[PDB]
């Protein structure tokens, strides 16, 4: 098993993470100067073309070899712990894959990177012609996200529903396993991920007339059914009573964009102070949030530069 070698491999990698002062420089640059800067970094090391499709691809391929190769390098008890983190990036691939089989559209225009399910699992799944067979091919790597899929697929074959019940059931699955793999660092974070999900499920489905109890799943810290119901009526006075959590910063805010920005920045923060717990999954935890967030800012800074958008429209979203 064991994170002893694996943590060590990641510590060398934390050396080539992009510090805050790069994005600071990049805003001052035009697209031509941005491109010269980008090539110094490790995302730059996969670059294959000046234009936009190529920037999206260099970023993605950097994430595929430095982050998406982690579950293979461990096994067992190590592997389950690392796997839960990786699983969110796999769910994104799965939801798109499930949707290409079902609505008959090509394999293309989806997210592919390795994680827990390999590239070949997604190709064999795609080519499967019965949803049940599609499901056994997915169940081969082993993970809680299969077991979550399997139960939802028994109730339904409707696209929109499978998507929602899979996500709900999946975070519930994740939580139980994670609580049983211990460590304070992971527990604090898990709580925030669920709390953030809860808020966020409420925002995405806002005003659809639905049940507010459906947007609250266990794992919480301070949020409950009533806050959800008020929130659903359109009242944001609930967020103004929400303190003692690091979402203290959501108070007095009522725009969906500022609210959701806020949750992603909070989750970033928890993970960045998990490096005072680098033992076990703590360090990897911090490493994945930072590679993800970094990749996102280079894509936003590249878009902002190419189309000559307003600076303040993106300067605020590239810092927490």
């Amino acid at each position: 098993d064991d994170f002893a070698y694996l943590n060590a491999r990641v510590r060398v990698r934390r050396g080539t993470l992009l510090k805050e002062s790069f994005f600071q420089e990049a805003l001052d640059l035009s697209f031509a100067d941005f491109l010269r800067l980008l090539s110094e970094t490790v995302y730059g090391g996969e670059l294959a073309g000046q234009g936009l499709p190529d920037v999206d691809r260099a970023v993605l391929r950097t994430q595929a070899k430095l982050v998406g190769d982690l579950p293979r390098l461990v096994t067992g008890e190590a592997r389950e712990a690392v796997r839960l983190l990786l699983l969110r990036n796999d769910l994104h691939n799965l939801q798109a894959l499930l949707r290409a089989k079902a609505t008959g559209r090509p394999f293309e225009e989806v997210l592919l990177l390795p994680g827990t399910l390999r590239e070949e699992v997604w190709r064999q799944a795609y080519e499967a012609q019965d949803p049940a067979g599609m499901a056994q091919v997915l169940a081969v790597p082993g993970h809680p996200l299969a077991r979550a899929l399997r139960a939802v697929l028994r109730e339904t074959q409707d696209l929109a529903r499978v998507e929602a019940l899979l996500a709900k059931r999946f975070f519930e699955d994740v939580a139980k396993a994670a609580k049983g793999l211990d460590q304070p660092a992971l527990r604090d974070y898990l709580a925030l991920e669920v709390d953030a999900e809860n808020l966020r499920t409420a925002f995405k489905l806002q005003g659809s007339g639905l049940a507010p109890d459906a947007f609250f799943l266990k794992g919480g810290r301070f949020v409950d059914r009533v806050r959800f119901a008020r929130l659903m009526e359109g009242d944001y006075a609930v967020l103004d009573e929400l303190s003692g959590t690091p979402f203290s910063g959501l108070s007095g805010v009522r725009d969906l964009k500022a609210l959701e920005r806020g949750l992603r920045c909070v989750l970033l923060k928890e993970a960045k102070k998990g490096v005072q717990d680098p033992l076990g999954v703590g360090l990897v935890l911090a490493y994945v949030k930072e590679r993800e967030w970094e990749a996102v800012r280079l894509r936003l800074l590249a878009r902002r530069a190419y189309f000559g958008l307003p600076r303040a429209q993106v300067e605020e979203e590239v810092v927490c």
Binding site: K179, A191, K218, G219, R221
Partner: protein, 80 residues
Amino acid sequence: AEEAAASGGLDRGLIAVGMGLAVGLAALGTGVAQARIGAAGVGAIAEDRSNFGTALIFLLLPETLVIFGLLIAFILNGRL
């Protein structure tokens, strides 16, 4: 030996050591078990502010094993 006197030679004392093994092992195990419940407690306090009580009761449960075992020990290592 006895739980209230200094009577006994070597024979009686050997009995003391042997009964002493129950108290050590049991105490060892009750201590490790309380720890799991204690950490588990973060979810109980976090999620619901009424299921903090369930956790209070849980920490109380491994202690029951040690105090009963210890009672057998005190008695039989307290006979004439």
